[PDB]
Amino acid sequence: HHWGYGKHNGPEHWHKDFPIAKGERQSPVDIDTHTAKYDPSLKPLSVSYDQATSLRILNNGHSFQVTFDDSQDKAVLKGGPLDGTYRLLQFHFHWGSLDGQGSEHTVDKKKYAAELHLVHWNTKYGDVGKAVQQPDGLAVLGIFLKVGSAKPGLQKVVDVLDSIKTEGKSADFTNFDPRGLLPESLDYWTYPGSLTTPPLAECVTWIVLKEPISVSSEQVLKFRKLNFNGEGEPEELMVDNWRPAQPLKNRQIKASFK
C-alpha cells in the first residue's frame, strides 16, 4: 500500500507516512498575484542549458521523467533568488484527466492543464540525496502548460511515451534539448517550499514562471495514455498526478516583475 493519487492513498493520506506533509513550508501553493510583492532586488534567472546531456526517460508510477547527467556543471540554474549553482537532475510533469486541472501551483486559483518541473540541486552539497536534507538544497523551475497550439520542442518526448507506458519502464533518451520547453519570458514568482511528492522534504526554492507554454490537445492526450500500474496489473490511467495547493502559512511569495 504505497502512496499515490487515488482515494485511498492520495495526498490527503500522505501525512501518515510523511508527517512533514503538514509542515510550515509545503508545496504547491496558490499564487495570489495581487499579494505577491515585487522585489526589485531579485536578479534575472540564469538558465544555462547549452551543454545539457539527457540520458533516459522513465515511468516511475507517479510521473515520467527525463534524466540528465548531473556529474558536472553542464546544465545549471543560477541567479534569480539563488545563491550558488544548481545542476539539472531531471524534468517531469503533472497533469489532469481534463484540461481544467493538472497543475500543482495555481494562479489566483486558476488551474492549468499541466505543470513542468525542472529539478536542480545545489552543488555545494555534492549530491542530490544530501541536498534534499538542506533548506536550500533544491531549486525547481515550474512552467505552466495550457492547451492550444502545439509545443514543437515537446514532441520528441510525447513520441516515446508509448515505450514507457507502465511503471518501471525506461528508454534511452539522448540529445533532448530542454531549452525547447521554455516560454519567452523568465519573469517569475519565488517562495520557499517543498517536494510535492513523498518524501515532501522542505528543501526547495520554488521558481514559477509567469508565462505558460502552450501544448496541443494531441500532446496532452499522449500524457493521459500512460499508466500508474505495472504491466500485468489492472490498467489505471496516469492522470491527476498533482498535489493540491497547501497552506501558505508564514511565507511571502515574491515577484521578479512589475
Ligand X SMILES: C[C@@]12CCC[C@H]1[C@@H]1CCc3cc(OS(N)(=O)=O)ccc3[C@H]1CC2
Min dist. Cβ of residue 199 to ligand X (A): 6
Could you say which of 34, 62, 105, 120 is catalytic? Answer: 62
When binding is defined by CB under 6 A, the residue of 19, 84, 126, 129 that contacts ligand X is 129
What's the start-to-end Cα distance of the chain, in Å? 47
Taking CA atoms, 177 is separated from 50, 80, 125, in Å, by: 8, 22, 26
Could you tell me which stretch among 127-135, 165-173, 213-221, 244-252 binds ligand X (CB under 6 A)? 127-135
Choose the contact partner of 195 out of Zn ion, ligand X, none; CB within 5 to 8 A by kind.
Answer: ligand X
Task: Point out which residues bind Zn ion (CB under 5 A).
Answer: 117
Contact 150, 159 (CB under 8 A): no
Sequence-separated (6 or more) residues with CB below 8 Å from residue 132: 121, 138, 195, 199, 201, 203
Report the site for ligand X in 196-215 (rule: CB under 6 A): 196-197, 199
Instruction: Give the separation between CA 176 and CA 197, rounded to whole angstroms.
Output: 25
Taking the least distance from each CB to Zn ion, the nearer of 117 and 169 is: 117
Taking the least distance from each CB to ligand X, the nearer of 19 and 152 is: 19
Estimate to the nearest angstrom the gap between the alpha carbon of 63 and the chain centroid: 10
Choose the contact partner of 52 out of ligand X, Zn ion, none; CB within 5 to 8 A by kind.
Answer: none
Residue 131 DSSP SS3: helix
Residue 2 is a catalytic residue: no
For ligand X, the binding residues (CB under 6 A) are: 117, 119, 128-129, 132, 140, 195-197, 199
